[PDB]
């Protein structure tokens, strides 16, 4: 079906104060985590974190465990390699992040693929959208780039992202149909709190919506008000749904001039909300 994604987010951290390193991976379909791996677990295995994924058999768990352990070992190595390239001390803790995955368009065909790396918070190396070449952030990443260009790592990635990634995503979308494939619209309200003598704060709330994308904007007489809008980060409820709010300070007595506009895939038509 429409916008869908399968993504894996991995994090390798060197720990010179503990003489070792740590690797963590999670997998997401859309906004829903379904598996994890942590090298600090005793008996570290790929683990289920959604009910629907547990009806995969042992060979799925075995294979995923083999492959994420393989990757953990190589990412252990990469951290050491990157220190060399950057000429860094052995005493600092460093972070290597890796995100890959696939995005299915509104027609359910593969629209984009990703495979990229960040070192100490900063973009390092990224598979281009053609899925035929790599972008490198600096001279260090040029070294990885040259190495991966000559080995044609892009082809192996292009095969994975167009084949197994999309097929897996489709099996997961089907296994988890009841939760992954229906959108829950937001429950909304508008609050009013006098916030100074001079001004009144209007807050437009959205609660209990999935998936997490949502548009909340304030309008007066057609013109948008995002200049002076405080918008919190969308945040998780803990039960699969999300919350957001947007607030605006308005002159007292002018409250009805202002409307909050809500767009979300769960809704039949966008809402126009007003303080009541």
């Amino acid at each position: 079906m429409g916008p869908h994604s399968l993504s894996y987010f991995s994090t390798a951290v060197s720990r010179p104060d503990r003489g070792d390193s740590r690797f963590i991976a999670v997998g997401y379909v859309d906004d829903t985590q379904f598996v994890r791996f942590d090298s600090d677990a005793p008996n570290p295995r790929m683990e289920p974190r959604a009910p629907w994924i547990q009806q995969e058999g042992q060979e799925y768990w075995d294979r995923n465990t083999r492959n994420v352990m393989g990757s953990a070992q190589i990412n252990r190595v990469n951290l050491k390699t990157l220190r060399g390239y950057y000429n860094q001390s052995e005493a600092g803790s460093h972070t290597l992040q890796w995100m890959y995955g696939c995005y299915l368009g509104p027609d359910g065909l593969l629209l984009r693929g990703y495979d990229q790396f960040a070192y100490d918070g900063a973009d390092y190396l990224a598979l281009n959208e053609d899925l035929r070449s790599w972008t490198a952030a600096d001279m260090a990443a040029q070294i990885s780039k040259r190495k991966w260009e000559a080995a044609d790592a892009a082809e192996h990635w292009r095969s994975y992202l167009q084949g197994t990634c999309v097929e897996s995503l489709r099996r997961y979308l089907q296994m988890g149909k009841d939760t992954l494939q229906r959108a829950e619209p937001p429950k909304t309200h508008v609050t009013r709190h006098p916030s100074s003598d001079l001004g009144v704060t209007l807050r437009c709330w959205a609660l209990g919506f999935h998936p997490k994308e949502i548009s909340l904007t304030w309008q007066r007489e057609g013109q948008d008000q995002s200049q002076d809008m405080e918008l919190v980060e969308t945040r998780p409820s803990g039960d699969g749904t999300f919350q957001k709010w947007a607030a605006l300070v308005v002159p007292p007595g002018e409250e009805q001039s202002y409307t909050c506009h809500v767009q979300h895939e769960g809704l039949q038509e966008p809402l126009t909300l007003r303080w009541d």
Binding site: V35, R66, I74, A153
Partner: peptide, 9 residues
């Protein structure tokens, strides 16, 4: 389905 890195940086 987790991909095994064949390549190292």
């Amino acid at each position: 389905d987790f991909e095994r890195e064949g390549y190292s940086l």
